[PDB]
Design a protein around this ligand. Structure first.
Ligand SMILES: CSc1nc(N)c2ncn([C@@H]3O[C@H](COP(=O)(O)OP(=O)(O)OP(=O)(O)O)[C@@H](O)[C@H]3O)c2n1
Ligand SMILES: CCCCCCCC/C=C\CCCCCCCC(=O)OC[C@H](O)CO
Ligand SMILES: CCCCCCCC/C=C\CCCCCCCC(=O)OC[C@H](O)CO
Length: 389
């Protein structure tokens, strides 16, 4: 009512920071639209990112109206409170909702029209839901601005309008946390799968060590008993690695040629150990060592290089796209939603002190800037792809 807010810093710092976002964002979205609208909608991920790029556009279009209003209350600030600021929040939760759907879609592809119709109807669901939340926030901004200095939208809203403001901010907390928990669960399952794929590849490489290091002992061996002990250990290690299922041959049947090449590949190496085993059983040292050294030949070394390469962890396991989403959530959306509820409470009722209401506003405005940073960082999911370079 009689509270004074220090605008000496916010009128220089924030319009300058938002000029940078408006500049970068238009270049980023300019490149994103000419790349995404020139390609067809053959997958669900393309449809969701085609909707995210048009939502990012409306978010960037809001910034010039904020640059002028924060720099200077008047008819411009009244309009910002009524139209542009509401549009910013509308497209923000649209971007969050689609980011959650992109995380689910990309997670389902790591585990493996009617499929495309589902993605298209879910797009309509998000756009209609957020508009039905934003529309009353625009209409109910009806209260005469008595003073030309009091720059707060809560003071320009009616009794029912202030109630709808409190409801929407709670619904938006539910919208954020449902999408944020979706991104956490998906990421955890991917990271858990990466550990499971690592252990299986580590056990495969350990069998190769109890085949390479044991062969070095045979080269320095003197008695027939020392060669016979190492030959039995090498045969067991090669047999154990043959039974193993690598992460590359995960979605492959045991009757497939790819699975058969891996099984027979080890049998060629097992055979050479078995040939030297017959010589070692009799009591031969030089005759058994010559047959054991046949595993180091140009042809057999290629087989060892092939079987090791098949065992290796693929790039399909390392999901960079889901990690970009979780990083965007922690930097852009998490700090903002951790300061919205204490700020919304100071807006609904004049219960806080002048210094208390001011401190909450500066924290809200600073965190709101990081939320705006997502609009210039969201098309990077498209830029870090195979068909984008
Ligand atoms: C999906 S539509 C939506 N979602 C919100 N979370 C949301 N939060 C606030 N709004 C609406 O956006 C308008 C201004 O938001 P605001 O953050 O309360 O204004 P402000 O940052 O200038 O804070 P004050 O100076 O008003 O205290 C206002 O009409 C309000 O009803 C919102 N609209
Ligand atoms: C990242 C969060 C940075 C937000 C930190 C900015 C808070 C500024 C602030 O509220 O300090 C003003 C002082 O309390 C007078 O009211
Ligand atoms: C990230 C946003 C950039 C951080 C914005 C720094 C907060 C500066 C601010 O708004 O605090 C000024 C206040 O008037 C002091 O009394």
């Amino acid at each position: 009512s009689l509270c004074t807010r220090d605008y000496k810093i916010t009128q220089v710092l924030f319009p300058l920071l938002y000029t940078v976002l408006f500049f970068v964002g238009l270049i980023t979205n300019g490149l994103a639209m000419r790349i995404f609208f020139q390609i067809r909608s053959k997958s669900n991920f393309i449809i969701f990112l085609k909707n995210t790029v048009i939502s990012d556009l409306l978010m960037i279009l809001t910034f010039p109206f904020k640059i002028l209003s924060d720099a200077k209350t008047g008819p411009l600030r009244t309009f910002v409170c009524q139209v542009t600021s509401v549009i910013f929040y509308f497209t923000m939760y649209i971007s969050i909702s689609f980011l959650g759907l992109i995380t689910i879609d990309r997670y389902q592809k790591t585990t493996r029209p009617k499929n495309l119709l589902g993605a298209k109807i879910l797009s309509v669901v998000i756009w209609a839901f957020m508009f039905l939340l934003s529309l009353p926030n625009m209409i109910l901004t009806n209260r005469q601005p008595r003073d030309k200095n009091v720059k707060k939208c809560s003071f320009l809203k009616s009794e029912f309008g202030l109630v709808w403001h409190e409801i929407v901010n709670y619904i938006c907390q539910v919208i954020f946390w449902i999408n944020f928990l979706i991104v956490i669960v998906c990421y955890t399952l991917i990271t858990k799968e990466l550990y499971r794929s690592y252990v299986r590849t580590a056990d495969l490489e350990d069998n190769w060590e109890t085949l390479n290091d044991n062969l070095k002992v045979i080269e320095k061996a003197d008695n027939a008993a020392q060669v016979k002990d190492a030959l039995t250990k090498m045969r067991a290690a090669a047999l154990d690695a043959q039974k193993a299922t690598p992460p590359k041959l995960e979605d492959k049947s045991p009757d497939s040629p790819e699975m058969k090449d891996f099984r027979h590949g080890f049998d060629i190496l097992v055979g050479q150990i078995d040939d030297a085993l017959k010589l070692a059983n009799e009591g031969k040292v030089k005759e058994a060592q010559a047959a054991a050294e046949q595993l180091k030949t140009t042809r057999n070394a290629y087989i060892q290089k092939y079987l090791r390469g098949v065992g290796k962890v693929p790039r399909k396991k390392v999901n960079v796209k889901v990690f970009i989403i979780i990083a965007v959530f922690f930097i852009c959306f998490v700090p903002f939603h951790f300061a919205r509820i204490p700020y919304t409470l100071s807006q609904t009722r004049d219960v806080f002190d002048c210094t208390a209401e001011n401190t909450l506003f500066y924290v809200k405005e600073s965190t709101l800037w990081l939320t705006s940073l997502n609009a210039c960082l969201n098309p990077f999911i498209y830029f870090f792809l195979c068909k984008s370079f």
